[model samples]
Target: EPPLLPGENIKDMAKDVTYICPFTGAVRGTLTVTNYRLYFKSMERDPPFVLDASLGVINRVEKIGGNSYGLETVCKDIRNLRFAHKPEGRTRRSIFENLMKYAFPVSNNLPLFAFEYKEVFPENGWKLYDPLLEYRRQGIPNESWRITKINERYELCDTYPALLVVPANIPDEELKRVASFRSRGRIPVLSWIHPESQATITRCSQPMVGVSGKRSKEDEKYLQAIMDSNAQSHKIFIFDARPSVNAVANKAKGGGYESEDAYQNAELVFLDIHNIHVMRESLRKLKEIVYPNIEETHWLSNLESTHWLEHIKLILAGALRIADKVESGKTSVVVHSSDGWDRTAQLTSLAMLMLDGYYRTIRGFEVLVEKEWLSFGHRFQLRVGHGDKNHADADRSPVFLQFIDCVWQMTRQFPTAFEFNEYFLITILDHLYSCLFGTFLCNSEQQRGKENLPKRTVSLWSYINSQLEDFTNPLYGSYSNHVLYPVASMRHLELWVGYYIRWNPR
Candidate 1:
């Protein structure tokens, strides 16, 4: 019974419950799902300690082990939780059902249910602005592009291009066959196209082991297809954004990370990122002090002990390295992780943001988010904890916030290069937890598509653009298509007081 958000309310509860954590196996607890968040209290603890995991933070509720009907919750954060129904999955299904209906109001995201605020937002002149319509009106190039839609009812696809730019030479059947055999059987899609080099930034899951449980020549061709799209793509640079060893042992089911010999013209590299669990646990310690204002040691002590920037350094360095190779105009890079979702999204979008100045514009940034964080499935719904009052979610994280932090550092180094100011970045960060808008409601592009985007819910850009004067920088100026350099030093990663503590009245 710590507290709840302004409009937060309990919709359901489960008693005699137990939660199985990723780090800690299991603990007896009372589980409750509310309109805004998910809460649990461990009975084993002397004081009945509580743990919160926002439904928004949950990537999906999937089955973990087969023998038992155990359900696992994978989130946008680094950690995931695995638990099950007591009577062989009965209770688990019930809880999952209730949580899906109540805890996550955006489950269907069918416009009406998802964007309840559209009723009052902007009052009279409240028609949604379809970005695709604007693009069409403005004569933007969208030959095969269609607004991203899911389940036919929602239309929130905003700025995400319909599909990644497909190369003119690659045939539909070749694309189909290649995807059919590649890693996770994933189809290679356009991420970004360099205007000058025509070099493309494409992303897909690591090649899945075939019937033989090993990489196939078809997968090699798929990689080659991605490389062949551009002239400068001489060497196929495959960056495996995974830890050094056993990265694909389980997923490949014995098929390793990559077989360089299979593709004579390619070089595979690993980013050496820690497992999701490690990233999850690290953020847990951080959220305790930051989000709901957890009381702890001094700021310096916090930084010294956590070494948060150290992790940031690795992520930024990885992103920069990818950009560095692509900018050389001598190579094309295919970035991937397990599913090519989390780490892959992190690397690709950030690299693009650093490279493209268009992404710095107000609408351009919306497209950037629409393209990278939202469209690419970075788990904004889970990462931001939209309606969640569970500020202490172990699965909660600041991945996008971290990206913004990195961008903020970049903006500082090149002050005039940015279109918006520090206030703009800080403002967006504040609203991420506020859940005052439906812009950041769902998990995937398709998920938001069902939400009916601009028509159903308000856009984040809607608010920022309304007060354009507030976020615009007087000193903004043109920059470059050259590679951007961001120093990932702790000294450069200080907490911004305007956002974190603005609610505390002076």
Candidate 2:
């Protein structure tokens, strides 16, 4: 049996299982299934071979009915597995049942592995992000903006965080009218503000300006108030994370972008970022070329064919525009995607990362994630499918993965600028699918509260912060307010070999 992690335990074990590695061929090993992982060890290789993976990674398990009645397991990660059993009475069936049961704990109506984990650390990461403290740190509520408790109970917007920062002059009653005009009641709320320029980055869902061209007086006034908040510039920019055509088409389905003429002082710009489906397919193509084997001959062509970097470039480019508009142009921007969760999050957080150096720090980065991604509600449970067996669920997209990938790209360009290392990013991704922490468990802040995640489960930050040296960047030159303008071109970007191709033999 393999060594267990803190709360991990062997739920089932089997002997003489044949693991069919694509390159290394078949090898006999003792397989062990735990609540957290599926581990196998063999003494056949020179130094022995070991295979260990979190059970949360398993997407599907199918029984093979060929000459060898074994199993085939598909994973969320780039790799798949083939197992050959001896057809010994009930051995294969028992393992399969256990895999199905634990691999898809949500389908079985069981608790996620995070709840069972009981690890204590010096710092409780759950206490890391307090909305009021974060806002105070940003020097907020200074005549231009006010922290409103109207959504304290999430009554105004269920998907939005309890704490919302909005235009200071606008009354709470007007916020409801603005909310009603916006899709999902996700009114424009402050995400980040410039320490010096006072220009802000706000995020929200699309306005319900459907066909027949609808407009709200309060909504227009709300945006005008946002523009007025920053005396640096009298104009506001609306960054729509969609193609011009897509945004236009959305008008047919009760969703649409802002009209320049209607808003008067606001200008609308489409970022041309693709939706979750396109990103999903891009990652799938990336998986095919990166895993099992690599083609040195057409490596560049293969990488380009995936279009993963193309998507990355577009996202970075979009964030750059937002950062430049806020920092250089001294203009406030309101960012939104279809529902203002996926691409909206990527653009706002990435822009904040470039414009503000605090996000480059380890703790500051955690707070950034907590504020922009987690607190704003990025739908982690639906996106990652934590313990769910619906492998083919259409909702399952690598949205958060793409965000982390963007962060990785930024860290690469400005290596000495960040306080965290490559290993830290990879670890976050591993546990994103590992379901070992409550940090990435639910869809929204409200859901986590309903489940009492902080009290019942361990935060990923607790574990990471407990041992900071491993994830800390030695080259980090103490933090700064200096903004980073990374080259968002293909020439500068490289595929993350340390992440996507790590499974492949070096």
Candidate 3:
């Protein structure tokens, strides 16, 4: 009755409860309510804490008494949970009737997360609550940061939360030898910086580990100096999105792209994606048909729901063919697979949100998801098994909830090119299947700076900047200048339904 996700249950439960621990202040509990989680378990003794939270990681639930009897809620990661109950009001009314029967139950965000107020967060609030000043407000948009030289050393490969923007008059320092190539050290990362056809797309992971493509004349002269820096001379050509016999059965050493006469004059194009273990078993068969049996799956006729919108139109058509070859300057393309963090951060951040309409706004899509998937670590607490439900935990799944359902299928096909809409990608994907936020907990950014995530947990843009026009985008018209034409077509991939039929029990 406590563990369930593939079609979850347990509508209610409670016992000896009284939890008000923003860090152990009161403890005595056994509160359950699972139309999809809201757990709590402790009986003191070792009850330092444990309160699961997920009714779509609620953002509001109140009914407090100055300082005693109670209920306090805030989520979508802005964390808060205080529950006291001398039955003063029959204790948080059964945790607010199973959190108003499964959070956002067909709604206008429960009266603005039960009445909101706040300021600042113009798209992706708190301008991303300081990840080292949003990586210096994403500087290095061009002129290849620190301009790289590698041997005599000017080496630049800024990695902590993100940085890597190359292209522009690189009068060759051996085209900065891809900052000394290696797979694990993973170079070439300026994934899609084309704000105005800056024309560049770089990502790494498949630099070689086997498939016997062995080489090392300084690794094919630093892979022919990163395909000759900006091959307008065009030969670095490789789209390899995976699936040409699983991309030559995934691997390489040097003779890999067939030796490229010492890693320079190269050409290898492959895409039809069958990479992230067949896109994580086609999103675990659409999370086994919706995160849980939401009142028998009727979010509007859910019959194997849109075949996960046809593998999301083959993952948005191989992220629009490596973002139409890095927005048609012909070649800066270097997308990889094996270790470029899962499907190479989903074909390079969904082809840099279809070639940078300032990452389709909302603080440029949270600075393009904190510079490509939480500063390039996309493990998000063993892929959302956060407190670790050890259901085997083979580095769990849901790969950033299928990259937020492929950005809610391109925010339902360009619904006014987003600034946060469709209830802010269905409440941060129900708080990424609710892990009570340390902002996607952790798997790296050096273990969320030793787990001090925004002053110890809670900051999904502080409940999306309180009620940002209730998750704005009433056809978000402040749309970035241009270049966002989505349309991969399953006739415009639908079925977002306020996020999979808002757990329909209506």
Candidate 4:
């Protein structure tokens, strides 16, 4: 049988072509190419044909052979009877391959491109992917870059992680002078007069009448300097006097005595002697007072002209309540009187004694033992009153010593008596050294007076040293060995002897 041609249709190949039954080998006639391929009667004999072709030329032809074949009679054409061919030598890749070659170089000699093989690049050095560097060519600070050490420690340095050293451009000499002065102590300096004095029955200093009614720029500057220094070492609490409960209440009701900005950044509290209702009202409005950086303002009630001890207890109890609140990690309270001396001192001493007692009963310590650990460093000032007698009384006031004794007694009653005793002994010996030398070693307030003062300041130092030597000499067997003989045998007495020797030196 011949292969079919492209132009020659299936009908011209055979008119009335004979078809046979595929299953029985029987012949049938009058087959016609109804479709372009072929079709016939007894259509169940074969399937209809579809054309098949290759490159060119007819290769094979299939026609319906028998009626026994399933489906219709059909004819099919096939072309291009040649065998498959294979190529010789190497063939070039597509444009995509050529483009990728120049675009992404695997070798070091290639030009810098977006997709270069970084590990095998020229000399194998690190290359920063900096867009700004290409355009600007300026050195920029690596703000995010951190310096991690071998010990797994890290610090932020240089341009990216900068430290802000405030009071910037301070002279080294001035700083040193300040440091020296701080090491020594500073006596309390008078800043301002109470405003309440202007309104007094006597034409003396009355509130809203004299110095108290007006804010002094010098005083503000002084307080600011103190705050700055405190920021460097401790926290500060500035108490404004003359603005009483009545004054604040009046201001709240639009009386307009004190501006809100006057108390900005510092806690400003009003004192109400016996007006609990006023205190409650003040506390409610305390949230409205703008004390930037400070958590809250503390309202202190003044001491009524009642029994002194009872007043002391009341103030102490109130302070404890505030301390308890502070301990709960909310807000801190700073108590102060107009002068920051008399009433402030009394309240501070009472609170200190109460804290000492509480700690003694619980943790069994009067003085905090851990040097770095600090709870609250409450601030107060000692005002110099009129007359030379005031100075003498200030120097020799037993109130401070009495407060110390209260703290000691409180610690002695600790639940864990042994722990209490340890702290008690340490505190006593420590203060003994301080009292004698006029220097608090633990709280080094010794150098503050040394920097700015004249040569006469050295006399104070000498006097304190002599006093300390005198006090500790008898206890350490340096002055009189006879007095130590009786107590030397006791264990607790021996502990005191050891502390005296360790804490005090000739």
lDDT of each: 0.61, 0.90, 0.57, 0.25
Compute the lDDT for candidate 1.
Answer: 0.61
Compose the digit string of candidate 2's lDDT tens values, residues 157-188: 99889989998899999999999999989999
Q: Higher lDDT: candidate 3 or 4? A: 3
In angstroms, what RMSD does candidate 4 have relative to the true structure? Answer: 43.4
Q: Which ten residues in a row are the worst by lDDT in model 4?
A: 198-207
Candidate 4 residue-wise lDDT, 1-506, digit = tens:
12433222232222223333222344433232211122233333455321222101111222212222222211111001111111221111221122223222222143212111111112111112122231122121122111112111111111010111112223223322322221111111211111211100000011121223444343233334334432122333433222376445544433322233543434444433322233323322322221111122332221121122232233434444433322332332344433233333434443333322322222222222111011111111121111111222332222332234333333333223222343444444333322111212111111222221222122122332233433221222122211111111112111112321221122
Query: Candidate 2: where are CA atoms >4 Å away?
Result: 66-68, 478-481
Separately for all candidates shown, the number of backbone clashes (residues 3 or more apart, or on different chains) is: 6, 0, 8, 40
- Give the runs in model 3 whose Cα sits over 4 Å from its true position: 1-12, 23-30, 39-52, 55-233, 237-263, 267-325, 339-343, 354-382, 386-388, 391-417, 421-426, 434-469, 483-506
Q: Which ten residues in a row have the lowest lDDT in candidate 2?
A: 82-91
Backbone clashes in candidate 1 total 6
lDDT of 3 by residue, 63-163 (tens): 77644777766543334566776654464676675676556442432221111212223344324644444324445433443333331221333333433
Off by over 4 Å in 4: 1-261, 264-308, 339-396, 405-418, 421-506
Q: Candidate 4 clash total?
A: 40
> Please, what are the lDDT tens digits per residue for candidate 1 over residues 1-506?
42565445576666767666534456776777765566888768777656775565565666544424556665543345665556643567667776656544444542222344433333311233343443444232333222222212222222233443444454555555665455444455667666666566678776656335455665677667667766765877888888766465645463355566787778889998664556656555664455434355586677555555666677888888888787775467888787676778778878887777777776667666666666656667655655443545555556676677667767777777778898999777655643446666667666666656656655666677677789987887666544677776667655545544443323
RMSD of each: 10.8, 1.4, 20.1, 43.4
Best by TM-score: 2
Check candidate 1 and list the clashing pairs. 56-382, 78-280, 155-452, 156-453, 183-207, 183-208
